[PDB]
Amino acid sequence: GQVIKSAVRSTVENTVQSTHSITTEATPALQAAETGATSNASDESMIETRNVVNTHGVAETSLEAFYGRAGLVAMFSTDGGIYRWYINFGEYVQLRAKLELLTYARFDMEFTIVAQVVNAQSKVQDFNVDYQVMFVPPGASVPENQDSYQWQSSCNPSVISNTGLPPARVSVPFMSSANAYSFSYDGYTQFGDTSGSSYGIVPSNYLGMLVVRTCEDLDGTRLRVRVYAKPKHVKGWIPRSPRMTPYKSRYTGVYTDTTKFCANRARITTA
Amino acid sequence: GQVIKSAVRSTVENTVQSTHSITTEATPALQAAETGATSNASDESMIETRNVVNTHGVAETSLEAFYGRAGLVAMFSTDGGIYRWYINFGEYVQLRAKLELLTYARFDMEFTIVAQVVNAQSKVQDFNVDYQVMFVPPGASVPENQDSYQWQSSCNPSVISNTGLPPARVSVPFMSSANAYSFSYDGYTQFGDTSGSSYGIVPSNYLGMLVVRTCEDLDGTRLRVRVYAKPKHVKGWIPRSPRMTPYKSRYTGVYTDTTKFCANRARITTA
Amino acid sequence: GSNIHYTNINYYENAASNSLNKQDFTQDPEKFTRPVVDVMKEAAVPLK
Amino acid sequence: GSNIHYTNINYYENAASNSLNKQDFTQDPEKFTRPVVDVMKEAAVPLK
Amino acid sequence: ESLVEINNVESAEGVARYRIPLNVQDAMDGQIMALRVDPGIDGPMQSTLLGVFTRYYAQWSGSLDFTFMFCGTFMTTGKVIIAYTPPGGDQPTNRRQAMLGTHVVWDFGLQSSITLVVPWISSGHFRGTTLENTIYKYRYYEAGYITMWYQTNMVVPPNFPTTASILMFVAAQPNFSLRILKDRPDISQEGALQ
Amino acid sequence: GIPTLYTPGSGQFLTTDDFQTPCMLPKFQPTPVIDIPGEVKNFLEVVQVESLVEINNVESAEGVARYRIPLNVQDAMDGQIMALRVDPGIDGPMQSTLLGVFTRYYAQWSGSLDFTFMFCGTFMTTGKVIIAYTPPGGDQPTNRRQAMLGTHVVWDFGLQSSITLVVPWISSGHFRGTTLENTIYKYRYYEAGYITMWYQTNMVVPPNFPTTASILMFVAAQPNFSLRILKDRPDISQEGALQ
Amino acid sequence: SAEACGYSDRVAQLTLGNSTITTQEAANIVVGYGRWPTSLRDTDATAVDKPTQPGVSAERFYTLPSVQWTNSFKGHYWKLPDALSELGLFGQNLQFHYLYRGGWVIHVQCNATKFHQGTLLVVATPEHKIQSAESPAFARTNPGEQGAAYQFPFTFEDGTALGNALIYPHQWVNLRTNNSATLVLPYVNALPMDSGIRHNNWTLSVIPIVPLEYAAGATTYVPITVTIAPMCTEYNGLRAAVTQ
Amino acid sequence: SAEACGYSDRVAQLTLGNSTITTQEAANIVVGYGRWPTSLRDTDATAVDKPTQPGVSAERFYTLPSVQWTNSFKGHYWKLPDALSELGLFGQNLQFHYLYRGGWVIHVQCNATKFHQGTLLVVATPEHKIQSAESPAFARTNPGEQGAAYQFPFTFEDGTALGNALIYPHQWVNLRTNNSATLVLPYVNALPMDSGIRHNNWTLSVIPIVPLEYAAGATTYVPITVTIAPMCTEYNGLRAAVTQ
Ligand SMILES: CCCCCCCCCCCCCCCCCC(=O)O
Ligand SMILES: CCCCCCCCCCCCCCCCCC(=O)O
Ligand SMILES: [Cl-]
Ligand SMILES: [Cl-]
Ligand SMILES: [Cl-]
Ligand SMILES: [Cl-]
Ligand SMILES: [K+]
Ligand SMILES: [K+]
Ligand SMILES: [K+]
Ligand SMILES: [K+]
Ligand SMILES: [K+]
Ligand SMILES: [K+]
Ligand SMILES: [K+]
Ligand SMILES: [K+]
C-alpha cells in the first residue's frame, strides 16, 4: 500500500550550478500549503547557484545516533537497606522528552548502575559494599525486607556488584508484549473503567520493577543508586510534535496552559 | 522400544485457515479422557481459523533456559573462623522447587561465592580479607579448626579469594556415581534399616561438604558467605507434579495437609 | 533473538567449563500427551 | 569519520548484547513532506 | 492436561474441589460454571501444570485446551454448552449472551468428553500472566471468560442419582509459549530450613 | 592467562560508549516486527517537514494569534511587514518549530532553509510583497531599497496561495554554531543574517471587506541540511524528580 | 492533462460502498505516511480466528453532525473509531468484536464565499491524548459522534506546539483557496489489531488558525462538516455487543 | 467405514464460524431438496448494488430459548429469519438492509433416557402460513426468538394434514433412537432476494406425535432446544436499521 518510496542516502544533497530563467512555464516558487505538502522549491530554482559537491554526512541525526547514549532514569537511596523502583522513564525529563519524539519504537537497552554509600546527612562515604539489583517481573513476589527469601533470586534475574567495582551493566532485549513500545497512547488501561487515572498509559510499557538492597546491613549509612538507560538497535515510527511545556507528573503528560512558547520582542518588524 | 517419536521444533505451530464442516464423519470435538491421552482437537477443527505464520520461539522454556541461571543454595557466617556446609539444595526453597520438577537430571554446575565481613551485630564491614573454601569429599578428614592441617589442601580442591575481589566462581562436572541425579527417591539409604529418617534420600546426591575459613584470624568480626549454584548442560527425564505445599524440612519433603490450593470464591458461577 | 554468528571457542579442558548449551528447541510431546498403543485420529471417535 | 575497517565480532548469544547499529543513513522524506496522491511537479503550479 | 480446581468454594474441601456439580433442573437455560481463562492468575488454574509453569513466567501466548469429562451413570443424559467470551465486557449474564461467542455444544454419550478450544484471540502477540491492577494496571491483558450452561437438561431414570459431576482439564495448545522467567509466587519460606 | 596491560579509561562509564555486554535474558525471543506505517530512520526526515513559526511574538499576541503575520491596507508605500533572524537554533520565533527543536538538540548546523508563506485573506484581496534574505555583515535592512539588494522573491497573491523564499546556505564555514550566545563563547560570530518582508505594492480590497488579513509562516530544512554534536535541549528542565 | 502538466486538479470524487462525495475546490488528497490502508498479513497476525470483513456495509461514508464556525471558535475534534462506534454496521461490527483493524478516508467540508477569509488546519493525529487536565474526563477523551470543542488549541490539548502538528497527516481549508480537505489514513498501532472501545488510533482535529472574517453583511453562519469512511476493515473475537 | 458399509454414523459435528455443535445420537443429516445453500448467480440477480457478505460474523450457530416438553405440549414453531432478527450480527445485517438471502443449518436437541418414550416431528416448511384465525395475530405469525406454541397441530395451523408435512424437509426425534435432528436448508423463494422483516421463507416446527411417557419416577422436565445457523448469506439495499 506504500505509494511513496524512501530511498536511502549517506550524504546530504549536492548543489548543481543553475542559470537564469525567464518564462511563463516553470514556476518553482509558487506553492500551496493547503495541500499538506511541504514546498518542493529547490535552491537551484530560486537563485543562480554554483556546483557544490557536498559530502556532509547524516549520521549524527540517525535514530541510533540520537538515542544511542545513556541517560538517567532512576535515582534513589535505600531505606532499611532496600528500595523498590517501578521501571518507568517518566521521573527524569531529559530522556523522557527524547522518547516522546516517536510514537512507536523498538529497541534493546543497556542499563548501567552507579552506586555509592552516603550517610544520614547525605555525605558520600568511601565504603565498599556489595549490593544486589533484582528484576522482579509483574506477578512475582516483591521482597518486603532486606533479608526476605525472594533475594534467593533463583528465577528472577539479579546482578550483584560492589560500590568498589566499576558500575554494573547489563543489556535487555525488546521486551514488550506489543510489537513496539508506545510513547503516546490515546486509550485506557482496562475495559469497564473510564476514570482519568487509567487514561493515556499503555500497561505493556511496564515490565516490572528493580528492587535494590545491600547484601548485608549497613551501620547507619544508606546505598545511593543511579540507574542509566541507553537505547540500542532503535527502530522508530511516526514522528511526533515535540514537548513544548514543562512536565509536571511522572505518569501523565498533564501540563500548565500557556499563551506563548518563545519570549516576546518589541515589534514584529525588528529582528 | 520407543513407539512414539519426538521430532524437534524451533517455533510454535502455525495456524492454517479452515472452513465450516457439517458432517457425521469427522468429530474432532468428541474426546475420551479415560484413555489417559490429552485431547487432540486442533484450533482449526473447532472454529473457522485464518492463516497465521507463527514465528514465536520456544527457547525460554527449554531446560537450559529454565535452569541456566544462578540461585542461592547456602548462606552462613563463620564461627571461630570456620563453617562446615554439607552440600545439599534443600535449605533454600526456590532452586529446590525448580529441581523437583524433574525426576532425574544430569548437569554440570557453576558455583559462585559472595563473601563479606560482618561484626557481632551483623553490620557489614568494609574489610578485605582472604578466605578459603575447601571441597571435602566424603571419607576425607574435615578440619575442626581454622588452623587445622587439612587446610593444606594438597588433594582436596580449594579456592582462595578475597572479599575485596569479585565473587569466586568455579564449574563442577556431573559428579554422581549414578547416571543422573534423582530429585525423587522412593527408597531407603541402606539395607537392614527401615527407619523413617533413612527414607526418601538417595545418598549418591550428596557429594561432600564445603568448609570455609578466613586464612588468618579476624578480630571480633566474622565472614558472611553466600553460595549460588547454576545448573549447566542440563539433560532431564520424567517431569513431575509441582510442589503445591510449603517445604518444612531441609532433608525431607514432609508437608502440612491442606483442603485447598487456591483461595475460595463466593460461587462456581461467578468468575 | 539469538545471533546467527558469534564466538564459540572453548578455553578449558573439561566440558563442564563450557558455557550454556545453545539449542533450546522443543520436541513432539506425544510421549507425555498421548502415550497410547492404539492411534486415535483427531477426526474419529476415540472409542468403539 | 567512521573507520572503513574495524572488528565486528559478536561475543554474546542474544542480539540485544550487540553494540550499536552502524548504518546511520537517512531516507527520502516524502512520506512526511509530500504525502499526497497527485504528483505536483516543482516547475508547475500546485493546483489547477 | 491436568485438573482445574474449579469448585473452589467454602463448602468444597480437597478432592471435591475438582468436581463441577451438575443436577436435574426444573428450569431452563441455567448456568453451571464460570471462570476467567487467564492461566497465570490466582484461582482454579493456579495449581494446574499449565498454571504452575505459566506462573514461572511473565508473559504467555497461545490457544488453550479445556476438556471436560462427564462422570454420571451410563443412563444419565444431557446437553450443555460451553462458551468462551473474548474480552471487552463482563462475563455473560445468561446463555443467550454467552452463545454469541466461541462455543461448543456437548452431548453426553459413549465418548465421555468434549474439548472447547479457547483460541488465542488477543490484540498483542503476548499477554502478561498476571492481571495485577493496583501497580501495573495489567487488567489490560484479561483474556476473557469460559462459562457453561445447560443446553437442555440432565435427565435420569427412576431412583437414579439426580446429581452428577464433570471433571475439568486444561492444557496448552501447540501454538502456546512463555517468555521472561520469574520466581513462582507460591514457593516461599521464612527462615532457612533445617 | 594471556598477558595483558590495562589502560587509562578502564572502569570509566562514558555515556556515549559502545560496547557489547551480557544480556539479562540471553534466550529471549522478541515479538515479530510488524508492518507499521511511518517508519523514520533519521531525524533529518522530520526537520524537512514545514511547521509554523511563532513569528508575531509580541505582547499583544496570545496563543494562536502569534502565528499570524498582520497585513493591512496601506496609505503609504514600501512599508515593512516583518523581520526575523534566520538562525534556526536561537531563542525566538523559531525555537518552537520542528526545525528549531531538533536544531536545539545539536551544537552545529548547515544547509539551506525553506521559508514558505501562505496568504489567508479573501479571494478578492490582492497584493504583492517582497521577501528578502540579507546575508550577514551588518544590521537588518532599514528599508525596502536596502533589503531588495539581497536574495529575494516577489510574491503575487493569487490562486496559488503560497510562496517559498529559499534562504540558501551562504556561510564562510561549512557549519555554524546553533547558538549566538556572546558573553561567553562570542558565537555572535555565526549570525546567519535576516529575513524581512515588505509591501511591494499594497494589499487591496473591495468595498466593505476586511482591511486586515493574515499570512502564515512555515519553515523547514532543505535537502542539503545537517546537524552535528548532540546536546541537551535547553527547553526541557525540572526541579525535583516527578511523582 | 493533470498528470501530464504535473498539477493536481481541484475537483474530486470519493466513492465507497453506496456513498459518493464530490468537491470542486479540493487541494489534492493526502495519504497518511504515503500508505493506503492494507489487510493484516499472515506474518503479522496473532489472533487465530477467521476474521469478519464486512465490506461495503461498513466501508462507506458516514456524515457526522455539523459544527458551527462561531466567532469564539477554538476548534473541534473527533476520536476514531469512537466517533462512529454507534453508526451503521461499522458501529455494530465494532461493538460485537473484541478486535478491530481499519483505515479511513476523511473529508472535511467548509464553504463560505469569495467575500470571506479564514483558515482551518485539518489534521489527523495518531495517538492524540487530551491531557490538559490532571484527570481527563471521559466526555472529552471519547466525545462520540458530536465530537468535542477544543479548549487549549495553542498547546494542541497535549502540551505540544499547535504549529508543529503539521508533522502529522494534514491539509488546510483556506477559504480563498479551497472548501474541503481529504485525508486517507492507514491503520497505525504498535499491535496488529486492538479494541475499538478502549483505544482511539487517530484523532481528527479542525482548528481555526486564521479567524473567520468577511465583508460586512455576508452570511455569518458557516458550518464545518465531517464525513468519514472506514476502509479495509477486519474484526476478530466475536461475542455479544459491548460498548465502552 | 460408514461410507464403505453404506450406513450413516450416529455421531456428528457441525462447525460454522466460532461455533461447534456435536451430537452422539443423530439420524443422518437432511439437506433440503438435496440442495446446499448457494450464492445468488449474476444471471438471477436484479438488485445492482454490490452485496454485503458478513461471513463468520453471521454464519454461525445461535441457540434460542429452550421450550419444555410439557404433558399438554402440542408443539412449537419458529419463523425464519424472524427468530434471529434481533440476534448478533445476523440480526443487525438483516435490519440494516432492505434485502436478504441465505440458507440455514438447523439442529434440534432433545435428550431423555432409555426409560423414556416419545416422538417429535422436526420439519422445516417453506412458506408456512399460520392461518387458523380469520385475522392472524402478529404475535403468532412472527413470534420472534421465543417461538410460538402450536394450537392446531393436527391441521398444521394451515388447513392441511399434519401427517403430510413429511413432504417438506424433516427428521424425527424418536427418543429410543436419537436425541437430535439436523437440517441444512437452501434459500427458497420466487425471488432472488427478499425483505427479512416482511417475509419468512421457512418455519421450523417441532411437534410431538407420540406423547412423552416414562418409567414412573424418571426425570419429568425434558427441554427441547433449537440452535440455528444462517449459511451463505448476502444483503443488499443498505440504509438505517429497520425492524418489522
Ligand atoms: C538484573 C539487572 C537489572 C537491569 C534492568 C532490567 C530492566 C528490565 C526492564 C526493561 C524495560 C525497558 C523498556 C521500558 C520502556 C517504556 C518506558 C515508559 O513508557 O515509561
Ligand atoms: C573448591 C571450590 C568449591 C566449589 C563447590 C564444589 C561443589 C561440589 C559438589 C557438586 C555437587 C552438586 C550436585 C548436587 C545435586 C543434588 C542436590 C540435592 O539433592 O540436594
Ligand atoms: Cl492473580
Ligand atoms: Cl482479577
Ligand atoms: Cl539564543
Ligand atoms: Cl542575539
Ligand atoms: K552528496
Ligand atoms: K511549484
Ligand atoms: K522544502
Ligand atoms: K511456526
Ligand atoms: K476426536
Ligand atoms: K490439546
Ligand atoms: K466480504
Ligand atoms: K466476507
Side-chain angles (χ1 to χ4, degrees), chain H residues 154-183:
Chain H
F154 189 58
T155 50
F156 209 52
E157 293 286 337
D158 64 9
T160 62
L162 170 61
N164 291 339
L166 308 195
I167 186 54
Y168 306 120
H170 73 282
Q171 290 206 310
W172 299 82
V173 170
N174 189 13
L175 299 180
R176 59 174 281 115
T177 305
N178 59 317
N179 62 30
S180 65
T182 302
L183 310 172

Side-chain angles (χ1 to χ4, degrees), chain A residues 1-3 33-36 104 179-180 184-188 191 196 199 238 240-242 244-245 253-255 257 261, chain G residues 27 30 33-36 79 126-128 130-131 141 155 159 164 168 170-172 174 177 189-190 195 198-200:
Chain A
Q2 191 64 38
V3 294
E34 296 93 337
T35 64
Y104 309 121
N179 304 89
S184 192
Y185 174 65
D186 179 25
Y188 289 78
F191 293 119
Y199 174 74
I238 308 178
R240 301 196 70 74
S241 183
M244 206 60 65
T245 54
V254 69
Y255 63 100
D257 186 38
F261 296 130
Chain G
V30 161
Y33 303 111
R35 181 75 76 72
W36 286 80
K79 262 63 171 57
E127 310 286 12
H128 191 173
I130 306 303
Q131 49 182 22
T141 63
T155 50
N164 291 339
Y168 306 120
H170 73 282
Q171 290 206 310
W172 299 82
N174 189 13
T177 305
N189 200 351
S195 167
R198 185 172 69 183
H199 184 195
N200 290 302

Side-chain angles (χ1 to χ4, degrees), chain H residues 39-233:
Chain H
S39 299
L40 178 58
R41 302 174 180 177
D42 299 339
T43 51
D44 291 347
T46 186
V48 308
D49 57 319
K50 178 178 291 180
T52 281
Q53 291 173 286
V56 301
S57 64
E59 288 154 30
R60 57 180 308 286
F61 285 104
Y62 294 98
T63 292
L64 309 180
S66 300
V67 176
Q68 189 196 343
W69 189 337
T70 58
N71 291 175
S72 58
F73 190 50
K74 290 186 177 181
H76 211 81
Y77 66 82
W78 292 263
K79 262 63 171 57
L80 295 174
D82 175 55
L84 283 61
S85 58
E86 285 172 49
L87 287 177
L89 283 168
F90 170 76
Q92 292 305 306
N93 278 286
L94 193 73
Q95 291 177 41
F96 276 95
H97 294 88
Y98 155 43
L99 301 174
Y100 140 80
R101 174 195 168 88
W104 309 96
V105 179
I106 298 178
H107 187 68
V108 176
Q109 308 136 77
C110 183
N111 55 94
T113 72
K114 290 175 166 59
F115 293 60
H116 289 71
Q117 59 185 37
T119 311
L120 299 170
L121 167 63
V122 177
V123 57
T125 306
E127 310 285 12
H128 191 173
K129 291 181 293 179
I130 306 303
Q131 49 182 22
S132 52
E134 292 290 353
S135 180
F138 183 59
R140 298 203 75 227
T141 63
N142 283 270
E145 65 200 25
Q146 293 298 313
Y150 258 85
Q151 288 175 180
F152 303 102
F154 189 58
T155 50
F156 209 52
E157 293 286 337
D158 64 9
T160 62
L162 170 61
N164 291 339
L166 308 195
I167 186 54
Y168 306 120
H170 73 282
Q171 290 206 310
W172 299 82
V173 170
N174 189 13
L175 299 180
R176 59 174 281 115
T177 305
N178 59 317
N179 62 30
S180 65
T182 302
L183 310 172
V184 172
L185 310 173
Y187 181 69
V188 297
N189 200 351
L191 305 165
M193 303 183 78
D194 210 335
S195 167
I197 67 171
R198 185 172 69 183
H199 184 195
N200 290 302
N201 322 96
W202 296 90
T203 292
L204 170 66
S205 292
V206 178
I207 306 169
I209 294 190
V210 174
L212 179 66
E213 287 185 293
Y214 39 80
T219 296
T220 66
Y221 201 78
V222 178
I224 292 168
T225 301
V226 176
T227 299
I228 302 172
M231 187 172 204
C232 191
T233 68

Side-chain angles (χ1 to χ4, degrees), chain A residues 207-267:
Chain A
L207 280 299
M209 71 154 76
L210 293 187
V211 61
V212 185
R213 72 159 181 174
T214 48
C215 298
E216 290 300 312
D217 302 319
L218 283 170
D219 197 340
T221 53
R222 301 169 293 170
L223 186 72
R224 181 65 168 174
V225 181
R226 281 186 174 75
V227 180
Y228 296 80
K230 179 183 78 182
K232 300 194 298 180
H233 317 136
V234 186
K235 193 172 182 63
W237 297 264
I238 308 178
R240 301 196 70 74
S241 183
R243 182 71 178 191
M244 206 60 65
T245 54
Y247 285 108
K248 304 178 66 178
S249 170
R250 175 187 185 178
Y251 297 112
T252 78
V254 69
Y255 63 100
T256 297
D257 186 38
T258 184
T259 60
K260 62 176 177 292
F261 296 130
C262 70
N264 293 323
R265 54 169 157 166
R267 64 195 73 72

Side-chain angles (χ1 to χ4, degrees), chain B residues 26-32 39-41, chain C residues 34 40-46, chain E residues 111 113 115, chain H residues 13:
Chain B
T27 60
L30 298 183
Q31 298 288 320
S39 170
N40 57 358
Chain C
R34 298 182 67 79
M40 295 181 294
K41 299 179 181 301
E42 186 188 344
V45 295
Chain E
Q111 308 315 313
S113 315
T115 294
Chain H
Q13 181 172 315

Side-chain angles (χ1 to χ4, degrees), chain G residues 147-189:
Chain G
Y150 258 85
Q151 288 175 180
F152 303 102
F154 189 58
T155 50
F156 209 52
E157 293 286 337
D158 64 9
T160 62
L162 170 61
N164 291 339
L166 308 195
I167 186 54
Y168 306 120
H170 73 282
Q171 290 206 310
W172 299 82
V173 170
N174 189 13
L175 299 180
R176 59 174 281 115
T177 305
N178 59 317
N179 62 30
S180 65
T182 302
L183 310 172
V184 172
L185 310 173
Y187 181 69
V188 297
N189 200 351

